[PDB]
Amino acid sequence: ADYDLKFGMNAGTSSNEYKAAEMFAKEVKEKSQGKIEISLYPSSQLGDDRAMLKQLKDGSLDFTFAESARFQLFYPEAAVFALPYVISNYNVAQKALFDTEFGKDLIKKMDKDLGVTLLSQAYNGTRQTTSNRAINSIADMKGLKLRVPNAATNLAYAKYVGASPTPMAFSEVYLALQTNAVDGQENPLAAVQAQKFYEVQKFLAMTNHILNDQLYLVSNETYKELPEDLQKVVKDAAENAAKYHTKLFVDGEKDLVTFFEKQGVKITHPDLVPFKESMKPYYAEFVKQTGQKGESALKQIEAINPKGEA
Ligand SMILES: CC(=O)N[C@H]1[C@H]([C@H](O)[C@H](O)CO)O[C@](O)(C(=O)O)C[C@@H]1O
């Protein structure tokens, strides 16, 4: 309580994100000798992730989560992180962020322009598509009222596969599915579990369309008033928590399809060839809109070997 800090998130109390944030908070409290306590504010209590990023910038929130892709709000070429099917796996997401000129520059800009320090990166799952009717092929997407987050890349996923997107905040999704205001949504398996979307969706299709990472971010305004030994406690704990976070997601992606089947969900495996082909005009539009910086980011990312960590 020398430093009463706050960590906001969209994810709820049953999520991997929350579990990993709990680990982070406990380690920081212990290794700071009680000087720092981090309280958690889940379920978008503080607003969504766009709002919480603004709060880090202003200094009114100390920690939050964001995807690398979310920075497309400020640097359009950063949409590359969530162009469907472009990033192959988490290894590529890691090397894109830390081992390309594009990624390194993004991290610097987040510090300089946006008032946030990137502490660590974790895996947050690969997005899949749930619905109230089976998705056996891309044909079943046509006219599907697909909820998406308020993010351009997810809206484009829905548009280009032929669905009818309805954007809304994460907090609103359960009701929309339950009432069939929409016919489906798309999120990684762990979120379908955490939010209990399986209670209100009979089908899950392995569309494998967007790879989510997760950044542990701190407000520069907060981090500057921690003496360096406490900065180190916070950084080391964020790195430890990110490895745990990733493991929770990796382990669940092995186990969760059976969990859902046990809950009465039918799992489909549509041919993804047409899904990937449908994105080609979107990639062209991305390059048009974002120009040389976008074409460069895409080339840098496509060059990455998806085999091997680092
Ligand atoms: C860090 C964070 O808040 N991630 C959230 C993401 C991103 O907001 C979105 O992918 C755009 O970047 O949206 C969800 O998946 C969603 O609303 O379905 C909830 C998830 O908790």
Expressed as residue numbers, the domain containing 19 is 1-310
| Binding-site annotation, residues for N-acetyl-beta-neuraminate | 10, 49, 67, 127, 147, 187
CA distances from 95 to 31, 43, 72, 193, 213 (A): 30, 30, 18, 28, 12
Sign of CA dihedral 46, 47, 48, 50: negative
Q: What is the CA radius of gyration of the chain?
A: 19
* Cβ contacts of 125 within 8 Å, gap of 6 or more: 187, 188, 189, 190, 191, 212, 249, 252, 253
Residues 298 and 79: their CA atoms lie apart, in Å, by: 10
| Structure token digits, residue 177 | 């599915």
d(CA 222, CA 309): 32
How far is the C-alpha of 194 from the C-alpha of 176, rounded, in Å?
16
- Say if ligand 1 is within 6 A of residue 186 CB: no
Q: How far does residue 186's CA lie from ligand 1's centre (Å)?
A: 10
Q: Is 149 in the pocket of ligand 1 (CB under 6 A)?
A: yes
Choice from 10, 71, 147 to test ligand 1 binding pocket (greatest atom count within 8 A of CB): 10
Resolution value (Å, 1 decimal): 1.4
30 C-alpha vs ligand 1 centroid, how far in Å? 30
Distance 70 CA to ligand 1 centre (A): 9
DSSP result, 6-32: EEE-SS-TTSHHHHHHHHHHHHHHHHT
The enclosing H or E element of 116 equals strand 116-131
Does residue 31 line the site of ligand 1, with CB under 6 A? no
Any idea what DSSP says for residue 265?
P
151 CB near ligand 1 (under 6 Å): yes
Whole-number Cα distances in Å, 93 to 119, 222, 235: 16, 27, 20
The one-letter code for the residue type at 138 is I
Cα(65) to ligand 1 centroid in Å equals 9
User: Contact at 8 Å (CB) between 107 and 220?
Assistant: no
Closest ligand 1 atom to residue 9 Cα is 3
Q: How do beta strands 116-131 and 184-188 pair?
A: antiparallel
H runs (alpha helix) in the chain: 16-31, 49-58, 90-98, 101-114, 152-160, 173-178, 189-194, 220-223, 228-262, 273-278, 280-302
**Residue 45: other Cβ atoms inside 10 A:** 12
Residues in the chain: 310
Q: Are 128 and 146 in contact (CB under 8 A)?
A: no
Q: Does residue 65's CB lie within 6 angstroms of at least one atom of ligand 1?
A: yes
Q: Return the sign of the alpha-carbon dihedral for residues 230, 232, 233, 235.
A: positive
Distance CA 91, CA 118 (A): 18
Query: Is 74:114 a contact under the CB 8 Å cutoff?
Result: yes
User: Residue 199: CB partners within 8 Å, gap ≥ 6?
Assistant: 178, 263
Which protein residue has the closest C-alpha to ligand 1 atom 10?
149
**Tally of structural domains, the chain:** 1
The residues, any chain, with a CB within 8 Å of residue 197's CB and separated by 6 or more, are 130, 173, 174, 177, 185, 187, 191
What is the residue whose two structure tokens read 């080609």? Answer: 280
Please tell me the distance between residue 69's alpha carbon and the centre of ligand 1 in angstroms.
Answer: 10
Q: Does residue 69's CB lie within 6 angstroms of at least one atom of ligand 1?
A: yes
| Chain breaks after residues in the chain, where C lies over 2.5 Å from next N | none
Read off the DSSP letter of residue 98: H
Contact status, residue 67 vs residue 212, Cβ threshold 8 Å:
yes
CA of 307 to the centre of ligand 1 (A): 26
**Residue 210, both tokens:** 């967007």
The minimum-distance atom of ligand 1 relative to the CA of 70 is 12
Query: What CATH number has the domain bearing residue 151?
Result: 3.40.190.170
Q: Could you tell me the distance, in angstroms and rounded to a whole number, from the CA of residue 170 to the centre of ligand 1?
A: 7
Helix locations, 79-227, DSSP H? 90-98, 101-114, 152-160, 173-178, 189-194, 220-223
